[PDB]
Design a protein around this nucleic acid. Structure first.
Ligand SMILES: Nc1ncnc2c1ncn2[C@H]1CC[C@@H](COP(=O)(O)O)O1
Ligand SMILES: [Mg+2]
Ligand SMILES: [Mg+2]
Lengths: 1341, 251, 270, 50
DNA sequence: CTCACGTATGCTATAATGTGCTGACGCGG
DNA sequence: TCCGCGTCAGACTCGTTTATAGCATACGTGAG
RNA sequence: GAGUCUG
């Protein structure tokens, strides 16, 4: 069972592992997230609903007035994506919000029966996400990259040494909210617990408990176990807990009953402990000297006097014991604190704590955050409560509370966003447990602690900031104003919210120009995760541990896709099957294994859930519809991998591909490639420019089709049915009755995007896939995007490649290409460049866009038309004028020479200059399109007006054809309904279709169908009118531009660039090269058959590189093409459909254990010859990643092609005709032309403009810049002799102003003499040091 | 200075000077007005804050943030940092008669030669062309010589061929770790946009042709030409200055 | 560790006495009569009020301290022109003065290019109008839409909104190195002017003796001052027609000297 | 790492061997970006001194 | 020689009088 | 606790928000 | 300055 577009061309699958779950929608993250932000939920606080309920209702400081939120609504977008992109505006919806101003009486207690004013106010336009996953901001397609941050909750960490060469591990807890101040607990080398509020100055940890109203004895009862001391008769006794001693050394002779258990001065082993516990020991007699040092728990006072004998937490002595006895206390609660397991930390922290009561603690906290400002009690209570116990300033969020509760081993997930007194103590408890040795530190790099924020969360946050700024303004105006005249909209400002959101979608680091070189570039960019930007790491901050692959990255993050650069490890591509859990942790699918049998039940497990189960590997062999074949299966748990028995196995990897990301999944024999080279391979696939002819990959993986479809660049059929009309512009499909709804007319129109500019100035062109009158299903590819073959992703072009040296023309990765490649226009690439000409208004006057330009040849003005605009279709070259522009010059006081010169030619040419937009030098192209943007008030150019005439008439035609095809399609249905119960075939066709409003039939369900079709017809009739009025308004609409700007003319050039020496090419195994020479066909190594090789690559760039994938790709590529050459031969000789069918079935069903079955037969003869015609230019094969083709399968395929098993062939030198002395590996490598063309990089400069302050030449080719002569380059001249070359570079070549002109004159005069001076940079340095008030003088000879 | 857009752009020193002048003049005012001393003090604190921000911003505690939030660049900041003036504009500079392009092999070359693209060399030797053009009397003046080059006339190629003869050009590759990261060659004019490098020197540059680029520099003076031909020529720098061994080694 | 200039000043203000009604009247009568202590105490006691207005005037132009100091200047003028005879309170009168001086300073100092209060006041009305338009028009105000509402000239509205365009630091997001010196000519252009100026001297000693004595003394090439056709008469020519015939006769023979040397149309483009 | 990679590139790595390879690979690549700075800083200190 | 034009300093009276981001690099002296 | 360091060039793109009474006399230079 | 890159 294959789909229609697959019947045209089937890829042979060498995969063996049946896929239980298909690749999901790849642009799932961006769409779900943003959809949640705009999604209207009444309850589920997501995006805007949450944002309003959080801030609102805002009540005044006086408390008379309050503003409350009702609901919001997004207006429909003013401009479609198309008009936004052309005009250079943000694609957004207006946000209208219903708000109710309610007012209370001050005289009545809280009477709400005074004034309720409800109105719908504008607060900004919110940018909308495209169906593809992008935002159009100021006419540029941009993607907002998902972020990876430390999850709110608690984290227990520890400086592993670092501080104090003592080398003490100091443990710390950090409580991180989603919003609020951070709460730190930490240890000191002296084992004192400290609190840092908001990482300010240090305070003793106990101070925070005093602020929460804890007495000393209550604190001690919380952290410490009590030990009771009974004073009986004269001897001292204490209540023993059998274990407590445990691993201690007995300081006294321990006697129980009458009989001695411990010997004094010996270590108490397990036997002593079990003996004591079984004997039921509860009292033991002890010496008085053992209590010297024990800490009293409670306050003990003299019942006689009523004064304190000893305060809580006080070190006991022999005399305090005596005083306690004689007062009448024969029971003393003392702290259990035996070092080791139970450390006295809080006991020692209370002794360091200078504060006494609650107030004294609150004052000291207040004095830390606000040092200097005198305390008040109300101020200190307010500040402390407003830190972590205010609903408005503190919010852990659901994820914070959930991770917090799980870290403290709770049962309940959900709870308060504010910190409870219990929370803080539990955290301190766990900290101290970890110090004692029971309990462990959480890992920051662990994905269980790293959470994903996609768009909607981030848009939500910026939107809350906007609201908060508004709340101050609103509350301020509610208090000042009279309440009754004043309506809510005069208080609200839209500009703060609009500004917050604008700054996110435009200024933000995560909002970046979509990487649109090719479909894969786009799709991978939209599934990016960055640890950088706001609320994240910095390159400075970023260490080595975060960057490296973490164990938990398995199935969630790609290990082999990360920028090789400063961003190495902070930016991560998402894995294939990976997805975000409800809280925003990453999760991966796994097949449940029940009683050893491996079900199709599939569970997404988070990073933390994964640790708990044993997961079998995907390559683990299952036995035909039940359990594992092998007894000891290779699995992984607790983040590490080994053999397990079958009963132990809980789960298994869903696919072999789930570890890898999208980009790397497209690499065929990844299994045989070094991970480094593979990284650069996946990275260069993103740089691949789509060629003029999009060629499929012969050696693919199968992700090719998934990527092409999910990217959105292909037009895919929603409804299916039969194609009514193809055109190089549009596809109209007539829908099938089964999916076709009986309401609207059932004709789908897909308009194709023709040759349009990309962000990287590449070309975006959609061509139609299907022919006129082709039946198609839902999800069939209707039109191919730029780098896509019939549904599959086609980033470049496969080529006959031979590995062997040439005469050094492939020296270090250098590539030797045949002229045939250039001739066949393979790797010829299309670049559409957008040039704008801006007419501004200056102090002197407005600039004119006339063809009337001072000092210009008729050659130049020939190409400009009446207005001063180049004609459509005109070929242009550097220096040709595209849009003529002249600028008003104010009164030119001329040099006498210019007075003479202007007098001689009399070409005074008025008071005007020449600022015309001309083609940049060396770029050459054909003008494909021109756009004119004018202001509303200013009189339109002749050329602007004829452009609007075209757009108007074209609009009219488009809408007219809509209503015509929709009416024809709709009456074609009425015709079929009327036949149902009323045979009038020939009689209905004769009377006009326009007079069918009269026509009905008997009152049944079919009469109601006629009413549906009649109401739709008229609905479309008026709809067509209001659509046309909208179009006409937008075409006439004068655009509001930047201030100063009267009009703008945008010219679009089309440049065809040929492949050429210097151009950069690569494969998909990270194998790069620069083309060194284009060899004549005659010269290139050729086969016994006479067929020349296309590309000659260097053997020596393989064994060092350890990317063996390229060689396997080449052997299989030749085998693929071997079978294509057999099918090509059989199609040339027509032959039998039966015979073709035989060969092709034997071919598809070759592999030793091929998963994919192809029961050819069912294919009709017509389907088979269309299939062979596609297979002729080489049978496409799919080698999944880690489940790829085996060497033996490739050699078997080669034998089917009658090609050699070695995949090496005899080659003959094109030049000499003699044979090469040994066989050469030849086959087909799929090759890519990257964006790095020599055309764009070549630059040269003799003299140019110079910098403002430093007077040195500028940098960069765009500014016509000199190459930087850096410290490093200077030192080289210092090492040599070269003193004159160095001075040259310092002086006449850079700053020295007089020197450079004088030496220019000398070089034209042919003197070749320097005449050096003083570099202007140094003159500046002097001025800058004197500006500091340091006298720096030059002292003369 | 006025940007093209009609807008202006200014140094942050102007914002810091304006701070200092406003507060200083306000201090003069409050002294003329005999203000109470608490307010005089506040103004004297603010004046010292403004001068300290102007001299060295960020040293006296929290630096004064301008328009974005980024701290204003003060006087000391223009001298101090690597980016100051020392490392950036003085110990190294941007340079005239300098170009770059992708490198590619020239196996046909001899050790002392390099393929230099026609259009690149045309531009780098512009004054040398102007000069020969006027000595042959083919160009009446400089402006006419410029327009003859712009038109890229056939006689100009022949003159350019004549100038480049025996004129050495410096090739440089980043990073320049040791002195052989700069070498002089005699250029060979070639059609096409890529620089052609001799294989045997690829070792010294650490040049592999998978897209690496090189800087070209023209030694102008007779002295600089001679220092390039004698000291810096490829042929003359065969042994590594680090160890005695030949750097020019087949691979 | 109180180091901050702001927190120091606000500490000093808190340390002041707060005034009542009868106390304000007593000090105010003595203050206008010219008491030293009365003026100082009224100022120092009312500093807290300046802070209140200065607090709700931050993040608009100057810093809190800057506004606090300028606001203090308003306090002084308030104490100078206070009327204790009127039963109405000081706080009410002072609030006007403090807001006036702060606003005025914020309109002047804030903007790098000093914008006059006249234009600033007009700008106020344009922007308030834009806000009311934005609330009802879901989109933002156009220049023409604002102009329609105020019944004012489109050009005047555009000039105003242009002046609103703020300039960011060139060194800050560098731009300095992108932007070239437009006033400085490249050595290429400067060398071309040298060639022209040198050729002129040689061209002056190639024509007639009376054809380069009135052609150069007019343009100011050899002479000292650039005269006109009528002003060449001051030397020896003393003619208007004969000066204009001879000026152009010098240029016609020189036009053929540039056609033969090989410029004319060659040096016409340039 | 205590478990070595038994296989070679001709044989092909499995998912676990490849994932384990990545660690060394990426640390190598990050080393070239980050460590180059200290090498170069040493060159510059040496140059200034001599 | 006189007025308009551009720019600036002036005054207004219910009472109101105390502030307020981002955190985390790592080695040496 | 503070302050000082942390390779060398190259390519491109983006980007420059905020609210601030109205009106009368006074001070000063330019244009007709 | 914040980017994504090429050595
Ligand atoms: N990150 C770097 N820092 C300094 N030099 C480098 C760096 N990368 C490359 N180089 C120099 C050293 C060798 C030369 C060739 O390197 P490639 O092929 O990566 O370029
Ligand atoms: Mg390299
Ligand atoms: Mg390399």
């Amino acid at each position: 069972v294959y789909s229609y577009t697959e019947k045209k061309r089937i890829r042979k699958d060498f995969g063996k592992r049946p896929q239980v779950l298909d690749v999901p929608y790849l642009l799932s993250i961006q769409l779900d997230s943003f959809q949640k932000f705009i999604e209207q939920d009444p309850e589920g606080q997501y995006g805007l609903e949450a944002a309003f309920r959080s801030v609102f209702p805002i009540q005044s400081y006086s408390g008379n007035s309050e503003l409350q939120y009702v609901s919001y609504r997004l207006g429909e977008p003013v401009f479609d994506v198309q008009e936004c992109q052309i005009r250079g505006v943000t694609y957004s919806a207006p946000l209208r919000v219903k708000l109710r101003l309610v007012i209370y009486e001050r005289e009545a207690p809280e009477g709400t029966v005074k004034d309720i004013k409800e109105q719908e106010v504008y607060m900004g336009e919110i940018p909308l996400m495209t169906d593809n996953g992008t935002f159009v901001i100021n006419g540029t397609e941009r993607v907002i990259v998902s972020q990876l941050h430390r999850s709110p909750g608690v984290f227990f960490d520890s400086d592993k040494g670092k501080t104090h060469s003592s080398g003490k591990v100091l443990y710390n807890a950090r409580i991180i909210p989603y919003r609020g101040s951070w709460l730190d607990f930490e240890f000191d080398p002296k084992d004192n617990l400290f609190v840092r509020i908001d990482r300010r100055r240090k305070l003793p940890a106990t101070i925070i408990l005093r602020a929460l109203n804890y007495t000393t004895e209550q604190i001690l009862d919380l952290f410490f176990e009590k030990v009771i001391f009974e004073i009986r008769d004269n001897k001292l006794q204490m209540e023993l807990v059998p274990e407590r001693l445990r691993g201690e050394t007995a300081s006294f002779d321990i006697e129980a009953n009458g009989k001695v258990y411990v010997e004094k001065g010996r270590r108490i082993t397990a036997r002593h402990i079990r003996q004591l516990e079984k004997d039921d020991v509860k009292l033991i007699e002890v010496p008085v000297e053992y209590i010297a040092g024990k800490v009293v728990a409670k306050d003990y006072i003299d019942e006689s006097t009523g004064e304190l004998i000893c305060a809580a937490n006080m070190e006991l002595s022999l005399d305090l014991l005596a005083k306690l006895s004689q007062s009448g206390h024969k029971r003393i609660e003392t702290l259990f604190t035996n070092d080791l397991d139970h450390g006295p930390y809080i006991s020692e922290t209370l002794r360091v704590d200078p504060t006494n009561d609650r107030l004294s603690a609150l004052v000291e906290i207040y004095r830390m955050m606000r040092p200097g400002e005198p305390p008040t009690r109300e101020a200190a209570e307010s500040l402390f409560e407003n830190l972590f116990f205010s609903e408005d300033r503190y919010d852990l969020s659901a994820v914070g509370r959930m991770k917090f509760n799980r870290s403290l081993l709770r049962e309940e997930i959900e709870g308060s966003g504010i910190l409870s007194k219990d929370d803080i103590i539990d955290v301190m408890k766990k900290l101290i447990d970890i110090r004692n040795g029971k309990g462990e530190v959480d890992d920051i790099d662990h994905l269980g602690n790293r959470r994903i924020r996609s768009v909607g969360e981030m848009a939500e946050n910026q939107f809350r900031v906007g609201l908060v700024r508004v709340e101050r303004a609103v509350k301020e105006r509610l208090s000042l104003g009279d309440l009754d005249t004043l309506m809510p909209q005069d208080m609200i400002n839209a500009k703060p919210i609009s500004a917050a959101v604008k700054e996110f979608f435009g200024s933000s680091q995560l909002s970046q120009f979509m990487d649109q070189n090719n479909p894969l570039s786009e799709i991978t960019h939209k599934r990016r995760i960055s640890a950088l930007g706001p609320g994240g790491l910095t390159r400075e901050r970023a260490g080595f541990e975060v960057r490296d692959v973490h164990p938990t990255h398995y199935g969630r993050v790609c290990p082999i896709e990360t920028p090789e650069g400063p961003n190495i490890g902070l930016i991560n591509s998402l894995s294939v099957y990976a997805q975000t859990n409800e809280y925003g942790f990453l999760e991966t699918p796994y097949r449940k294994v029940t009683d050893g049998v491996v079900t199709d039940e599939i569970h997404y497990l988070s990073a933390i859930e994964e640790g708990n189960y044993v997961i079998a590997q995907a390559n683990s062999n299952l036995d035909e519809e039940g359990h594992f074949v092998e007894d000891l299966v290779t699995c992984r748990s607790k983040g590490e991998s080994s053999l397990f028995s079958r009963d132990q196995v809980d789960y298994m990897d869903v696919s072999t591909q789930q570890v890898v990301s999208v980009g790397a999944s497209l690499i065929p024999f990844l299994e045989h490639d070094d991970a480094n080279r593979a990284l650069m391979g996946a990275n260069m696939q993103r740089q691949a420019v789509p060629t003029l002819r999009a060629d499929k990959p012969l050696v693919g993986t199968g992700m090719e089709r998934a990527v092409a479809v999910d990217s959105g660049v292909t037009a895919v059929a929603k409804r299916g049915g039969v194609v009514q009309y193809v055109d190089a512009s549009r596809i109209v499909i007539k829908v099938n009755e089964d999916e076709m709804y009986p309401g609207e007319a059932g004709i789908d129109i897909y308009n194709l995007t023709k040759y349009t500019r990309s962000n990287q100035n590449t070309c975006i062109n959609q061509m139609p896939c299907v022919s006129l009158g082709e039946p198609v299903e839902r999800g069939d590819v209707l039109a191919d995007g730029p780098s896509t073959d019939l549904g599959e992703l086609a980033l470049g072009q496969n080529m006959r490649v031979a590995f062997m040296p040439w005469n050094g023309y492939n020296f270090e990765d250098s590539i030797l290409v045949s002229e045939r490649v250039v001739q066949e226009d393979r790797f010829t690439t299309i670049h559409i460049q957008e040039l704008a000409c801006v007419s501004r208004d200056t102090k002197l006057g407005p600039e004119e866009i006339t063809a009337d330009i001072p000092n210009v040849g008729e050659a130049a003005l020939s190409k400009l038309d009446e207005s001063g605009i180049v004609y459509i279709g005109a070929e242009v070259t550097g220096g040709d004028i595209l849009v003529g522009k002249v600028t008003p010059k104010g009164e030119t006081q001329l040099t006498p020479e210019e007075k003479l010169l202007r007098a001689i030619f009399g070409e005074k040419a008025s008071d005007v200059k020449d600022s015309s937009l001309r083609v940049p030098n060396g770029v050459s192209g054909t003008v494909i399109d021109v756009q004119v943007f004018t202001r509303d008030g200013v009189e339109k150019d002749k050329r602007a007006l004829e452009i609007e005439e075209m757009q108007l008439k074209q609009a009219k035609k488009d809408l007219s054809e809509e209503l015509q095809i929709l009416e024809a399609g709709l009456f074609s249905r009425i015709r079929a309904v009327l036949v149902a119960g009323g045979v009038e075939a020939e009689k209905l066709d004769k009377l006009p279709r326009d007079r069918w409003l009269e026509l009905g039939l008997t009152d049944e369900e079919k009469q109601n169908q006629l009413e549906q079709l009649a109401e739709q017809y008229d609905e479309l009739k008026h709809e067509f009118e209001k659509k046309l009025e909208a179009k006409r308004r937008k075409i006439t609409q004068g655009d509001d531009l930047a201030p100063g700007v009267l009009k703008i003319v945008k010219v679009y050039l089309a440049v065809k660039r040929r492949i050429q020496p210097g151009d950069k090419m690569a494969g998909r195994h990270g194998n790069k090269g620069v083309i060194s020479k284009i060899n004549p066909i005659e010269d290139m190594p050729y086969d016994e058959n006479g067929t020349p090789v296309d590309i000659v690559l260097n053997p020596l760039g393989v064994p060092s590189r350890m990317n063996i994938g390229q060689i396997l790709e080449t052997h299989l590529g030749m085998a693929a093409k071997g079978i294509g050459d057999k099918i090509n031969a059989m199609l040339k000789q027509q032959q039998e459909v039966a015979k073709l069918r035989e060969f092709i079935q034997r071919a598809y069903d070759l592999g030793a254990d091929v998963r994919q079955k192809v029961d050819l037969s069912t294919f009709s003869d017509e389907e088979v010859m269309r299939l062979a015609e596609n297979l002729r230019k080489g049978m496409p094969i799919a080698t999944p990643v880690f489940d790829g083709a085996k060497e033996a399968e490739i050699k078997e395929l080669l034998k089917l092609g009658d090609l050699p098993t070695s995949g090496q062939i005899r080659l003959y030198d094109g030049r000499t005709g003699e044979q090469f002395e040994r066989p050469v590996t030849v086959g087909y490598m799929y090759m890519l032309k990257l964006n790095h063309l020599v055309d764009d990089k070549m630059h040269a400069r003799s003299t140019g403009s110079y910098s403002l302050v430093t007077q040195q030449p500028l940098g960069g080719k765009a500014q016509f810049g000199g190459q930087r002569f850096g410290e490093m380059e200077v030192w080289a001249l210092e090492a040599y002799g070269a003193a004159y070359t160095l001075q040259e570079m310092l002086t006449v070549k850079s700053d020295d102003v007089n020197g450079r002109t004088k030496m220019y004159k000398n070089i034209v005069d042919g003197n070749h003499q320097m005449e050096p001076g003083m570099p202007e940079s140094f003159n500046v340095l002097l001025k800058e040091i004197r500006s500091l008030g340091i006298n720096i003088e030059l002292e003369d000879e | 200075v006025p940007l093209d857009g009609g807008r202006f752009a200014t140094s942050d020193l102007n914002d810091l000077y304006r701070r200092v002048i406003n507060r200083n003049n306000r201090l003069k005012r409050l002294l003329d007005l005999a203000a109470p001393d608490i307010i005089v003090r506040n103004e004297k604190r603010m004046l010292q804050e403004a001068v300290d921000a102007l001299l060295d911003n960020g040293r006296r505690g929290r630096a004064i943030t301008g328009s974005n939030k980024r701290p204003l660049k003060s006087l000391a900041d223009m001298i101090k940092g690597k980016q100051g003036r020392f490392r950036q504009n003085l110990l190294g500079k941007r340079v005239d008669y300098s170009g770059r392009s992708v490198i590619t092999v020239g196996p046909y070359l001899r050790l002392h030669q390099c393929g230099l693209p026609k259009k690149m060399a045309l531009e780098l030797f512009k004054p040398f062309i102007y000069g020969k053009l006027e000595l042959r009397g083919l160009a009446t003046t400089i402006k006419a010589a410029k327009k003859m080059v712009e038109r890229e006339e056939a006689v100009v190629w022949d003159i350019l061929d004549e100038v480049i003869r025996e004129h050495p050009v410096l090739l440089n590759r980043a990073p320049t770790l040791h002195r052989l990261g700069i070498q002089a060659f005699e250029p060979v004019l070639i059609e096409g946009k890529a620089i052609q490098l001799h294989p045997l020197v690829c070792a010294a540059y650490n040049a592999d042709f998978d897209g690496d680029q090189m800087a070209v520099h023209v030694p102008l003076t007779l002295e600089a030409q001679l220092e390039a031909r004698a000291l810096m020529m490829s042929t003359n720098n065969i042994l590594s200055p680090a160890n005695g061994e030949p750097i020019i080694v087949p691979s | 560790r109180v180091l901050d200039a702001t927190q120091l000043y606000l500490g000093e203000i808190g340390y002041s006495p707060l005034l009542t009604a009868e106390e304000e009247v007593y000090f105010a009568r003595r203050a206008l009569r010219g008491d030293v202590a009365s003026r100082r105490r009224m100022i120092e006691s009312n500093l807290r009020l300046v802070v209140k207005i200065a607090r709700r005037y931050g993040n608009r132009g100057l810093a809190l301290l800057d506004l606090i100091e300028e606001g203090n200047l308003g306090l002084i003028r308030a104490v100078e022109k206070f009327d204790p005879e009127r039963g109405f309170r000081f706080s009410t009168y002072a609030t006007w003065w403090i807001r006036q001086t702060i606003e005025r300073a914020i309109m002047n100092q804030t903007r790098t290019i000093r914008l006059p209060i006249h234009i600033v006041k007009e700008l106020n009305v344009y922007l308030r109008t834009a806000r009311e338009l934005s609330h009802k028009l879901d989109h933002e105000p156009s220049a023409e839409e604002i102009a329609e509402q105020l019944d004012k000239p489109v050009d005047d509205v555009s000039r105003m909104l242009r002046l609103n365009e703020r300039g960011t630091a060139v060194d800050t997001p560098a731009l300095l190195d992108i932007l070239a010196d437009e006033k400085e000519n490249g050595p290429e252009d400067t060398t071309q002017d040298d060639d022209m100026k040198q050729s002129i001297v040689k061209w002056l000693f190639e024509l007639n003796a009376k054809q380069r004595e009135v052609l150069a003394r007019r343009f100011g090439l050899l002479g000292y001052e650039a005269a006109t056709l009528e002003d060449v008469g001051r030397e020896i020519g003393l003619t208007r027609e004969r000066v204009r015939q001879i000026q152009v006769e010098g240029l016609r023979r020189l036009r053929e000297i540039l056609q033969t040397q090989g410029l004319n149309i060659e040096a016409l483009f340039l | 790492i205590e478990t070595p990679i038994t296989a070679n590139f001709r044989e092909g790595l499995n998912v676990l061997q490849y994932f384990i390879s990545t660690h060394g690979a990426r640390k190598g690549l990050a080393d070239t970006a980050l460590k180059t700075a200290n090498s170069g800083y040493l060159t510059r200190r040496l140059v200034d001194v001599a």
